[PDB]
């Protein structure tokens, strides 16, 4: 009660009245720490920093993040932050004190599940899991389902790959019965989801593919659907080629054509090709599937598209074996197997916090030194999270301890551009994009190398691209932009290793960018009006500064989507600076994505926006991304 240790006492001592069970909401561990250090901890909190969140930003904390006692809010926002700092840092009080300040000052934040659970008795701080279907058998299928149920119990998303499950009509031993396929098994996972979100990963040569991409269709002929599951395609290059050559494409059942999902690139093309020649599947025209994809995406925004070969060929985890899927948001690309469930350890840097208006009037700069610095901090945090996390299933524990993948991201890209008066499609924006990501990658790699010196390289380092001094941009065959000194980094890496197999994967930010008052991660603004009803504060400030914020605006703006193009009284520079995402060529979007990608270890959630969507425009948009070498060609398609 207005004092951190007292708040901790309360949450710690809490008893569920309606039942008589003591229900501690702090772990023993963090309780004792707060107690053994109450003074330092109590007097470090700056309560002034609570009115630094917007109305609707602070009300997202209150609505859902601040711990509550009897439906009444138990935590002030700084208590939350301080709680998280400790949950992350344990006995490391100086580290915790640093994390507290930087979060409270809004330099970065941590994913929702960290915010919810850090400090509490079963601290599941990890943002999502990637699950391998354990085996094409009732035992295998029910063992997986159990595992998802256990996982889906402490919430957090699941990315499930099912390339190895046989398709409708496939043969089954000891019975006259024929297999029913994927759809009815999807249905089982649907029902388990609803009982306790899901992405499903499939390679497009799977014989149940036509039905699988229609998982989210509206005209639901009862039994063949399955909703709040999201289908994602794990596309090999061969598919895209057949589609552009207008050639054939063969559907197989994994039992007649085994191994397809356990090789990529040329080994996959030989194995695939050899299976076509051997008459093991059913050939159709590549474009019949292509057309069904596009049709499904136009109506439902799914399936997502993640390029299998790009992902595997350019992954520092390639020494592990072949990577069979991404995650629910299409940013994580990490190895998974029957006994290794990959985990997403996520945090995001607040890009705008590094803008500085220096000795002058209107000059702004970007403090890349502070950026590098903070990303070193967040790298250290995400390591602790790996160690201090609660693992809902053993598979997850094995995966994280063994390869230690980390997942850094960003938010307030669009804000940064705007504050610095840079159109999203300016050459300056193009350049800032590159430098921002160069410095984050460089920082996290540097910090991760330091850790390898103290605690050793992750178990699985020897034999990896990084161990051979092949870093991410090398696998893109590009020279780094050169703001940072990569030689020295790479030399140290080869000497000492790094602690983390992977480190970058800019994700969706949803409610954690809301609290901080910034825009969805790295996409631009969808509108200059969200909803109540509030206008883009930068656009707002400029319309006041010109006096034109007369009612011929607040009204206009809402009945125009929040667009400013073709307003009669607004300078062209403002027009260029406040384009809606519907007004930015998806071509620029993809280019900037391709630019930043040589600095992304993993992938990123690349939402795509089309105005007057034709099947042809979509097709060019997929191929464009494809040929740019992107791992994630598309997360959702938003349209109309």
């Amino acid at each position: 009660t207005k004092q951190f240790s007292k708040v901790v006492e309360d949450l710690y001592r809490y008893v569920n009245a309606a039942t008589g069970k003591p229900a501690p909401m702090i772990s023993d561990d963090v309780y004792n720490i707060v107690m053994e250090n109450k003074d330092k901890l109590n007097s470090a909190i700056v309560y002034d920093r609570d009115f630094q969140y917007s109305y609707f930003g602070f009300k997202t904390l209150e609505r859902s993040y601040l711990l509550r006692i009897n439906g009444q809010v138990a935590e002030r926002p700084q208590h939350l932050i301080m709680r998280v700092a400790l949950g992350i840092h344990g006995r490391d009080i100086e580290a915790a004190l640093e994390t507290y300040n930087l979060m409270s000052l809004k330099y970065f934040t941590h994913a929702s599940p960290t915010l919810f659970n850090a400090g509490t008795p079963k601290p599941q701080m990890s943002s999502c899991f990637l699950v391998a279907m354990k085996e094409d058998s009732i035992e295998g299928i029910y063992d997986t389902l159990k595992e998802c149920a256990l996982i889906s119990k402490t919430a957090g998303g699941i990315g499930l790959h099912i390339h190895n499950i046989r398709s409708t009509g496939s043969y089954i031993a000891g019975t006259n019965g024929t297999s029913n396929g994927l759809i009815p098994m999807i249905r089982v996972f649907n029902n388990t989801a609803r009982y306790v979100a899901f992405a499903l990963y499939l390679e497009p040569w799977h014989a149940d593919i036509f039905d699988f991409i229609d998982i989210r269709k509206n005209h639901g002929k009862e039994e063949i659907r399955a909703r709040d599951l999201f289908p994602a395609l794990w596309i090999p290059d061969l598919f895209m080629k057949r589609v552009e050559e207008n050639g054939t494409w063969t559907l197989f059942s994994p039992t007649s054509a085994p191994g397809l999902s356990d090789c990529y690139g040329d080994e996959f093309e030989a194995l695939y090709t050899r299976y076509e020649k051997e008459g093991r599947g059913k050939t159709i025209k590549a474009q019949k599937l292509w057309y069904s994809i596009l049709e499904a995406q136009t109506e439902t925004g799914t399936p997502f598209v993640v390029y299998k070969d790009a992902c595997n060929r350019k992954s520092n985890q390639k020494n592990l074996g072949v990577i069979k899927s991404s995650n629910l948001c299409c940013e994580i690309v990490e190895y998974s197997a029957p006994d290794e469930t990959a985990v997403c350890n996520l945090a995001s840097v607040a890009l705008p916090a590094f803008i500085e208006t220096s000795e002058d009037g209107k000059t702004s700069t970007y403090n890349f030194k502070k950026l590098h610095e903070i990303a070193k901090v967040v790298t250290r945090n995400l390591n602790r999270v790996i160690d201090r996390n609660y693992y809902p299933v053993e598979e997850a524990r094995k995966s994280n301890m063994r390869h230690r993948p980390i997942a850094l991201g960003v938010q307030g890209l669009a804000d940064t551009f705007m504050l610095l008066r840079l159109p999203f499609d300016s050459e300056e924006a193009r350049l800032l994009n590159i430098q921002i990501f160069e410095t984050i990658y460089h920082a996290s790699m540097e910090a991760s190398c330091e850790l390898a010196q103290k605690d050793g390289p992750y178990e699985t380092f020897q034999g990896s691209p990084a161990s051979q001094g092949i870093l991410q941009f090398d696998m893109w065959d590009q020279k780094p932009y050169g703001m940072w000194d990569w030689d020295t980094l790479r030399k140290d890496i080869m000497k000492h290793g790094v602690r983390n197999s992977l480190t970058m994967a800019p994700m969706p930010t949803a409610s954690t960018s809301q609290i901080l008052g910034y825009n969805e991660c790295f996409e631009p603004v969808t509108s200059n009006m969200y909803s109540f009803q509030v206008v883009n504060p930068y656009l707002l400030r400029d319309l006041v500064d010109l006096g034109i914020w007369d009612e011929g605006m607040k009204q206009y703006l809402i009945t125009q989507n929040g667009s400013i193009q073709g307003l009669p009284n607004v300078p062209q520079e403002l027009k260029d600076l406040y384009k809606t995402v519907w007004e930015i060529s998806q071509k620029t979007i993809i280019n900037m994505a391709a630019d930043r990608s040589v600095y992304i270890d993993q992938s990123h959630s690349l939402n795509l926006f089309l105005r007057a969507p034709t099947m042809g425009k979509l097709t060019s948009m997929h191929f464009y991304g494809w040929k740019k070498g992107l791992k994630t060609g598309m997360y959702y398609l938003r349209t109309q």
Partner: peptide
Amino acid sequence: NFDDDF
């Protein structure tokens, strides 16, 4: 099929 105006 291939409209490059996106």
